[PDB]
């Protein structure tokens, strides 16, 4: 994973996202959704999804939330106050903690001013607590600004490392982007049916066709402008739409 003071930032993009494999995986110790309850994720579409990744202590997972304070949310990773995404977290004691102490996971514990939301700060200047200038050397009131979790496998819970992923769905002003997945059923031919073909809503009997649709078209229409043929996605085979039986 990535440190807590330099988190990562992956920009998931146009794709088919299935938040159900996440939501029901039961391997996550924390799955909170803020802008939007979890079950309705696989039914919405946004412009961009960002995924941020890092590693913190066990009892610091309550500062990854909109409107908190503490050494993590103050100056390591700040979430805006109208967050939209979801926060996922799971214990990782066996991967990240090693006997003798894993001193490779640092965090920032001194900063001049709290972070703006989603702001990032990887500098390593000597902090200056008191009024006396520091001149790049340590001493009283001149402190190195980074500390390291010394993780060890015999730590009580709440001191073992947790890995965190923060998904943030954003909606700029584009034309569209990634969203939940679609589900198609079987093809029942020869029965007055109520159908939807990726947007085309209608009723009627569906029948095998013999018309030769171009190499880019979708459906077919007739004079007086009524839909009378469609193309199925799963297979891509011409099909006619005959009105029902009335009289």
């Amino acid at each position, epitope marked *: 994973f990535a440190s807590v003071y330099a988190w990562n930032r992956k920009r998931i993009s146009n794709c088919v996202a299935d938040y159900s494999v996440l939501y029901n995986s039961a391997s996550f110790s924390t799955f909170k959704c803020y802008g939007v309850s979890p079950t309705k994720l696989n039914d919405l579409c946004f412009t961009n999804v960002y995924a941020d990744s890092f590693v913190i202590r066990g009892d610091e997972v309550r500062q990854i939330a909109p409107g908190q304070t503490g050494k993590i949310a103050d100056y390591n990773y700040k979430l805006p106050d109208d967050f939209t995404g979801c926060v996922i977290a799971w214990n990782s004691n066996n991967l990240d903690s090693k006997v003798g102490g894993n001193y490779n996971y640092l965090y920032r514990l001194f900063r001049k001013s709290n972070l703006k939301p989603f702001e990032r700060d990887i500098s390593t200047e000597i902090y200056q607590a008191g009024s006396t200038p520091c001149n790049g050397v340590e001493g009283f009131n001149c402190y190195f600004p980074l*500390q390291s*979790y010394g993780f060890q496998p015999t730590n009580g819970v709440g001191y073992q490392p947790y890995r965190v992923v923060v998904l943030s769905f954003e909606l700029l002003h584009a034309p569209a982007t990634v969203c939940g997945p679609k589900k198609s059923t079987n093809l029942v031919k020869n029965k007055c049916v109520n159908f939807n073909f990726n947007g085309l809503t209608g009723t009627g009997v569906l029948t095998e066709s013999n018309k030769k649709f171009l190499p880019f078209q979708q459906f077919g229409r007739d004079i007086a402008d009524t839909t009378d043929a469609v193309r199925d996605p799963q297979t891509l085979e011409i099909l006619d739409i005959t009105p029902c039986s009335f009289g």
Partner: antibody
Amino acid sequence: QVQLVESGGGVVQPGRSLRLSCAASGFTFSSYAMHWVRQAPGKGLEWVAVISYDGSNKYYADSVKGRFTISRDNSKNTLYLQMNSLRAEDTAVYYCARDGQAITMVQGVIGPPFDYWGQGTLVTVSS
Amino acid sequence: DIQMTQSPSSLSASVGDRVTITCQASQDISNYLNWYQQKPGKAPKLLIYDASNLETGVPSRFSGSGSGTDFTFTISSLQPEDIATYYCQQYDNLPYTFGQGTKLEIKR
């Protein structure tokens, strides 16, 4: 398991010198930190001194400096506070406690501070 | 670097009530502290790490609230064996200052 024992205090005249003993048990001693804290009888607690995992990081308090010194034995799981130039005023009960959360001190943050398994007093009169 | 904390010291209430102790912190904002109880004739004892999140053994009648420069210990549902002092230690510098204590007394 984790418990501490202390000895070395008694009655002595002012101006003299005395060293204490703060021993450990159970846990690994040379990874933690060790604090020194006191209270004059009938008053509140007061932090006295601290040292890292034998890394020579004292950062003493006010007045205390130049009169106190810290020495721990990582090999024998013991810790000694030696004080010189007494004032006939620092007569108190004294406690040593473990830390795992300081900044320029012990590597990595581990557990809670100040788990407080000590005791032991010292009288400084003329009787 | 000199800081100090305060306390509404020397309170008194009865069985089955709620008490509050407010350690207001000095300048140079900090980040969580602690809460100790001290039965007299003995050694102190940890109850709550920085801000909140008590430890083990504690009968879970205790709560903190850490928000910068003013922290409030809050105990609910008093019990007839929980009268002692209560000194809070603040950390994050060279000199780890303390509070002043809070003596407790029943009602007769």
